[PDB]
Amino acid sequence: QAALYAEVQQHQARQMHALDEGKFEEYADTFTPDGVFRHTPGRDPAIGREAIVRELNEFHERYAPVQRRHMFTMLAIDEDSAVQADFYTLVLTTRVDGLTVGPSCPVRDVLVRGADGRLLTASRWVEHDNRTVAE
Amino acid sequence: QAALYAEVQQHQARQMHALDEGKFEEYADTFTPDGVFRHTPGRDPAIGREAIVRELNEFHERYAPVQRRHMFTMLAIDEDSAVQADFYTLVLTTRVDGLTVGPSCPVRDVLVRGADGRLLTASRWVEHDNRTVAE
Amino acid sequence: QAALYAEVQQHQARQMHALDEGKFEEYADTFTPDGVFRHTPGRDPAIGREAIVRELNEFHERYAPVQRRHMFTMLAIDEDSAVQADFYTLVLTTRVDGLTVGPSCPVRDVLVRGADGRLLTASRWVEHDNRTVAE
Numbered sequence: 455q456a457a458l459y460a461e462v463q464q465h466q467a468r469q470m471h472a473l474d475e476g477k478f479e480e481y482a483d484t485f486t487p488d489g490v491f492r493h494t495p496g497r498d499p500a501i502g503r504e505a506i507v508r509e510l511n512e513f514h515e516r517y518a519p520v521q522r523r524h525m526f527t528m529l530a531i532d533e534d535s536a537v538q539a540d541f542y543t544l545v546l547t548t549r550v551d552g553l554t555v556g557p558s559c560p561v562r563d564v565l566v567r568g569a570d571g572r573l574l575t576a577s578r579w580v581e582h583d584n585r586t587v588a589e
Numbered sequence: 590q591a592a593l594y595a596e597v598q599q600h601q602a603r604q605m606h607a608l609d610e611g612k613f614e615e616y617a618d619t620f621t622p623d624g625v626f627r628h629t630p631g632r633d634p635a636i637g638r639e640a641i642v643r644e645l646n647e648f649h650e651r652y653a654p655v656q657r658r659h660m661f662t663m664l665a666i667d668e669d670s671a672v673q674a675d676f677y678t679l680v681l682t683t684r685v686d687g688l689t690v691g692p693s694c695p696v697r698d699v700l701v702r703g704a705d706g707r708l709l710t711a712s713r714w715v716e717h718d719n720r721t722v723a724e
Numbered sequence: 725q726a727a728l729y730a731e732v733q734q735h736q737a738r739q740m741h742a743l744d745e746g747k748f749e750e751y752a753d754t755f756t757p758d759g760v761f762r763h764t765p766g767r768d769p770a771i772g773r774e775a776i777v778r779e780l781n782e783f784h785e786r787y788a789p790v791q792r793r794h795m796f797t798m799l800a801i802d803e804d805s806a807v808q809a810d811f812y813t814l815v816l817t818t819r820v821d822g823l824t825v826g827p828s829c830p831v832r833d834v835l836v837r838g839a840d841g842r843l844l845t846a847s848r849w850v851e852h853d854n855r856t857v858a859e
């Protein structure tokens with residue numbers, strides 16, 4: 455179980471390196487072909503890689519000379535073939551005028567193993583602490 | 590030693606998921622029955638689960654529509670039955686009006702194994718960088 | 725490979741505990757004797773332990789009653805004897821007047837194993853998101 459814990463962290467790190475450098479297709483390829491990505495509460499999830507890549511192009515043309523970073527911490531995993539991962543995300547956004555911190559986001563991932571033994575994300579369910587607090 | 594490193598991270602993650610969702614009793618149950626929690630310098634530590642749960646109800650009624658998050662990083666462990674954990678904490682607090690970042694806190698934990706093989710926290714000793722800098 | 729992942733995190737944690745407490749010599753001793761440290765883009769890297777310790781004394785006398793913290797997240801490792809580590813750094817600086825957050829920094833480390841089996845840093849290559857965004 456220790457080895458899976460490190461494997462999930464490695465997989466999440468690679469995922470986010472690709473996302474934050476704008477490689478939206480590489481990011482979608484770390485999801486399963488039917489992968490669910492609910493990135494913002496209220497909005498319906500993107501489902502499948504094509505919908506994921508499209509929803510990231512929407513979100514990023516919508517607000518774009520910017521460098522975002524997603525910092526994951528506080529990972530807890532739980533278990534036939536699938537694993538649930540609960541963790542914290544902190545979003546950072548660097549502009550020429552400075553660095554905006556937030557939001558803070560609890561996230562639940564579900565991972566499965568592919569045919570080649572590599573992990574893939576079946577689902578990612580993001581909450582937003584700012585939006586949770588309003589309600 | 591690698592496997593213990595992941596086990597400490599998993600245990601700390603579960604602890605803080607319970608604390609940050611206000612499940613103060615679940616949090617106290619991850620400490621030993623005689624567990625020491627020195628959460629703020631100057632103040633005497635809460636000792637035992639009941640004192641821990643009481644001191645968290647004091648601290649949180651004292652300042653409460655809020656969502657706090659504790660992000661742990663930079664874990665280093667050292668060693669018969671006990672393990673010392675040194676790490677960094679960053680506190681985040683989300684209000685309707687926004688997100689306050691800080692303080693930054695170096696923390697020392699001492700963990701032991703219970704009868705059932707699960708880890709428990711014998712002690713947690715928190716420093717506050719803001720208060721350290723004044724002195 | 726899981727065990728190396730935890731070993732790199734442990735090594736990075738110890739390195740930064742020494743740096744952030746101003747133990748610049750201990751920090752330089754976690755690098756190889758010919759270790760490369762490019763801490764800021766544009767400036768030439770410090771090479772060897774003596775140059776590292778000197779460049780940290782320059783940087784810190786240059787701006788110093790302060791407590792800095794370096795939080796590492798998002799580690800991904802890749803491979804005869806050497807390992808590459810890509811990760812995120814977030815810098816925190818606590819003053820009497822408050823806490824400044826940033827910058828956010830992608831970092832690449834190269835680690836090797838010493839004669840005694842302990843890891844050492846052959847190179848550390850820091851980028852600055854704020855400076856990357858200007859260009």
Ligand SMILES: CC1=C2C(=O)c3c(O)cccc3C=C2C[C@@H](CC(=O)O)O1
Pocket residue numbers: 473493494513524543545556557559561578580
């Ligand atoms: C694009 C985006 C997010 C993410 O993509 C995300 C993620 O991929 C993994 C883990 C967490 C997240 C969190 C977010 C937050 C949201 C960004 C925003 O509201 O500024 O919209």
Ligand SMILES: CC1=C2C(=O)c3c(O)cccc3C=C2C[C@@H](CC(=O)O)O1
Pocket residue numbers: 608628629648659678680691692694696713715
């Ligand atoms: C309630 C509280 C803290 C914690 O409980 C804490 C912790 O449980 C584990 C690791 C670190 C911490 C740090 C703190 C800081 C302190 C909060 C504040 O001063 O706002 O008071």
Ligand SMILES: CC1=C2C(=O)c3c(O)cccc3C=C2C[C@@H](CC(=O)O)O1
Pocket residue numbers: 743763764783794813815826827829831848850
């Ligand atoms: C002293 C310093 C840095 C570091 O030393 C550093 C590091 O040792 C490991 C990993 C990342 C870093 C990042 C920095 C950033 C830079 C600090 C600044 O510009 O304020 O100058």
